[PDB]
Amino acid sequence: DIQMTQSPSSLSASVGDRVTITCKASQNVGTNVAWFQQKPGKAPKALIYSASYRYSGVPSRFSGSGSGTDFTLTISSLQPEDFATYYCQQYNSYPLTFGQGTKLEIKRTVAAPSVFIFPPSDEQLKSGTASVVCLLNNFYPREAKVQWKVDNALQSGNSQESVTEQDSKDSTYSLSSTLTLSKADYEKHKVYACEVTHQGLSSPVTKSFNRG
Amino acid sequence: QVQLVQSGAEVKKPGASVKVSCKASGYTFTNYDINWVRQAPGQGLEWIGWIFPGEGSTKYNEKFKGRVTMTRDTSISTAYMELSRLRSDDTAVYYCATELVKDYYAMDYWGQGTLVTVSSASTKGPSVFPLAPSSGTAALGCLVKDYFPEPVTVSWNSGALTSGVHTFPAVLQSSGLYSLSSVVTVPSSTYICNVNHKPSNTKVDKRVEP
Numbered sequence A: 001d002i003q004m005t006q007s008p009s010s011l012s013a014s015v016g017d018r019v020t021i022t023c024k025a026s027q028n029v030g031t032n033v034a035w036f037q038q039k040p041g042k043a044p045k046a047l048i049y050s051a052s053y054r055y056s057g058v059p060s061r062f063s064g065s066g067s068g069t070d071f072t073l074t075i076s077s078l079q080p081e082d083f084a085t086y087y088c089q090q091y092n093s094y095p096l097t098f099g100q101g102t103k104l105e106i107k108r109t110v111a112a113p114s115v116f117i118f119p120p121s122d123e124q125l126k127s128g129t130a131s132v133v134c135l136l137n138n139f140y141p142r143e144a145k146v147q148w149k150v151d152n153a154l155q156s157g158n159s160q161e162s163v164t165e166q167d168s169k170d171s172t173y174s175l176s177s178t179l180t181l182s183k184a185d186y187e188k189h190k191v192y193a194c195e196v197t198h199q200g201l202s203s204p205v206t207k208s209f210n211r212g
Numbered sequence B: 001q002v003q004l005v006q007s008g009a010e011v012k013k014p015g016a017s018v019k020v021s022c023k024a025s026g027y028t029f030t031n032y033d034i035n036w037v038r039q040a041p042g043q044g045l046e047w048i049g050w051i052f053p054g055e056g057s058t059k060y061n062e063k064f065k066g067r068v069t070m071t072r073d074t075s076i077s078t079a080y081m082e083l084s085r086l087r088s089d090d091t092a093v094y095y096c097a098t099e100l101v102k103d104y105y106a107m108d109y110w111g112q113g114t115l116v117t118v119s120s121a122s123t124k125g126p127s128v129f130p131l132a133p134s135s136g137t138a139a140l141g142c143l144v145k146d147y148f149p150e151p152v153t154v155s156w157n158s159g160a161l162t163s164g165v166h167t168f169p170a171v172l173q174s175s176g177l178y179s180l181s182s183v184v185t186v187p188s189s190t191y192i193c194n195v196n197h198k199p200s201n202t203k204v205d206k207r208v209e210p
């Protein structure tokens, strides 16, 4: 296999910015390199072939360059429908190999996460399970960290997280960290708190409640 | 107009096989290789192989040698991809694709994608639990827990409340069932999450209240 390595894996730019994205092959591959664009939930749209030649319908602001082992995709003036993930691919040798994506996101001003906390519902306790949910609403950048504590005992495992995409109106992110435990174990403990750390906060922030 | 149509989504149990189809219209089917690429949830693109419909010749990724068979039916302009001995990592959207040069432009054509879910779980509707507010704006939502397979839809107030709504990407729990939360912000001054699971015909409107 030839490895295709892309860098950075993500980048924050703005409309009109000139964006440059690299792609490096573990072996010389001549000019046999393709670039794809893909939106979440949609198939890829081919952009470039033969390193520098555009596909039909691909706007001229997308330009390709490179030869041998170093390759580049250039967006001359970033337009709003260009925010997407971009894959290079070699086809000089089998198996055909892709690099990981280079996700292209919208830069904006720092936002602190609005932290809320929800307890397990009575409809769920009658069922025998317990789900506590810590919500992080409208923050930027994407990087964050949530940590759980029951009676100030730091929790490890049985907690999973999901992060939405950039909101279409304010480009912000939102996170849901879900901690799940037995109803038995839920009653067996008193106070529950989730600690939220985000560079838009001067110190850790914690929301908490006391039931069980 | 060139079009490639794929078979519908499927759920398979580990060790089974799946045969995905890709029907071509709008061009000479025997003149161009059909390529298959897959993308697991949240991951990148991986190449499976191609078949040349003119002669039925194939080339496969070595990572699948022995598990994947590609065939053609020229009479109905269809290419098939059969993946055998299914495992959990095989869970991905499978795409067929071809590339042509008419006029003078190279053009690429893609299928709509076929979701192949490999899981020992069985179809189950979700249980919707309210996330009630707790004292300037209030936040509330719904916890859609324990459904299989994907997807589940969530709307609020029968589609009237689109603003300030954040429905989270589902998470796969170790139990093989999916769960996602869906939240919304409202000033502290009714609200109903409409949840529908097509694979199990489960439709549950749940009103949230503090």
Ligand SMILES: CCC(=O)N(c1ccccc1)C1(C(=O)OC)CCN(CCC(=O)NCCN)CC1
Pocket: A034, A046, A049, A050, A091, A096, B035, B036, B037, B047, B097, B098, B099, B101, B106, B108, B109
């Ligand atoms: C699985 C991805 C992949 O690899 N490919 C692909 C891309 C989009 C849609 C379908 C297939 C190609 C492939 O299989 O590589 C040989 C298809 C043929 N292009 C050749 C471009 C060209 O030079 N066209 C003009 C020649 N006159 C190279 C890439």
